[PDB]
Every structure is written in C-alpha cells, then in structure tokens.
Amino acid sequence: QWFPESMRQQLSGIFAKLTKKVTLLQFLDASDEKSLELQSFLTEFASLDQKITLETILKDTEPAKELLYGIEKMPSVVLLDAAGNYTGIKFSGIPSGHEVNSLVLAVYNVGSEGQPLEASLQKNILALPKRKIEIFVSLTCHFCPDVVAAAQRIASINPHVEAEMVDISLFPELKKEKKIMSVPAMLIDGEQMIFGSKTMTEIIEALA
C-alpha cells in the first residue's frame, strides 16, 4: 500500500549499496492512530531489504531507553547502527510521501560508508560540538528532504550531533509557539530559527 513497484525498483537500487545492518526502533503508543500508521509504514519499509530491521517497543514501558533516545514527540522512530548504538537520527511523525527520501538517505548513510566527500567537509563535520538539530517539514514540501538528509548525514558521522525530522503539521501548538510559517525550517538546540533551503556547507556553518 505504502510503496508502489515504481518506487521499490528505485529503492532496491539504493539498498543494494548497504554494507552494514540497520535497526529502526519505533516507540509505539497502541492508543494513538498515528503510531499504528507509522508501524504499518515501517513494517512495509523494513521488508525492502534484509539489512533493515524493525524493532517495536511500547511507549512508557522502557523509561531508560526513552531517556537515552530523548523520546518526546510522537509518533517516534529512531535509527540504530549495526552495533545497536543510537545514531542521533530520529523521525517525529511519519516520513511518508516525499519524506521517504529522508528515511532512505538516513538508512543509507548509517548502513554504508556513504558517498565520497571532500576532506575539508569531512574534517568540519567531525569538528562540531554537541548539537541537537530539529528540521521541520511537511509531507508535500519538495525541498524539505534534502535539508533533512544533509542534517541527518552529519548526525551519522559525528557522534555528538543529533538530527530530528519533525512533521510540523502534526504539532500545531509548536508551530504557533516557534513561529514556523515557511518550511523547511531548522532549529538548532533552542536559540536559532533558520528558514529556507540550505546546503551542507551552510548547515555546518550554522552548527560551528
């Protein structure tokens, strides 16, 4: 239902490049509709390749784990590498529709060596401090996934950077509070709100 053969053909090409295992860990609230929707989406996504595993934990049954991953917004899924460690990559909401690009890229960067990158960028990425990036998106926003994938790639490389995709349409009170008028919007820690499309260099500069 979620993925047509047209898209499975595309994603099969990318998931052939996976050299390492990857775990998608959902924190499932059984009484919320969006959680069960996310489970359905992730179940079908995980069946696209053997190296992708879906693990399910019920919300409010593992407080130690929820602390460790910083599980606040719902619905929620986090990415773990082959060793079982938290990559810093999180999705708050369902990355369906056009955000499938973000989940695919995140899984690729965690499940492989990644694309070859300029050494100047590589050393700038490793040089960053402790950071928490929130990338606000809508499911129909065409320029959003590229910004999510750039931020979430930094998180995959640097162990202290964390990158959370947030479907802002699911959190209307946060939209008014932080004044998220356009999208993609990007919030680093608390502090700095950055609207519009951005490059890897610009994102690293705002994270410096």
For the chain, what's the residue count?
A: 208
Listed in sequence order, the residues at least 6 apart from 83 whose beta carbon sits closer than 8 Å to its beta carbon are none
Whose CA is closest to 25, among 60, 77, 61, 71? 77
What angle, rounded to 10 degrees, do the helices at 119-126 and 144-157 form? Answer: 70
CA 206 to chain centroid:
19
Do strands 86-92 and 161-167 pair parallel, antiparallel, or not at all (unpaired)? parallel
Q: Which tokens is 44 given?
A: 């079908």
Resolution attained, angstroms = 2.5
* Token pair 């990007």: residue: 186
Residue 30's CB: how many other CB atoms inside 10 A? 9
Whole-number Å distance between alpha carbons of 166 and 139 = 10
Per the CB < 8 A criterion, the answer to whether 207 and 194 are in contact is no
Residue 124's CB: how many other CB atoms inside 10 A? 18
**What CA–CA distances, in Å, run from 114 to 61, 93, 117, 188, 204?**
34, 25, 8, 24, 17
Whose CA is closest to 199, among 165, 157, 150, 161? 150
Q: What is the dihedral of CA 4, 81, 109, 178, to 10 degrees?
A: 90
Listed in sequence order, the residues at least 6 apart from 78 whose beta carbon sits closer than 8 Å to its beta carbon are 24, 25, 27, 69, 71, 86, 87, 89, 90, 91
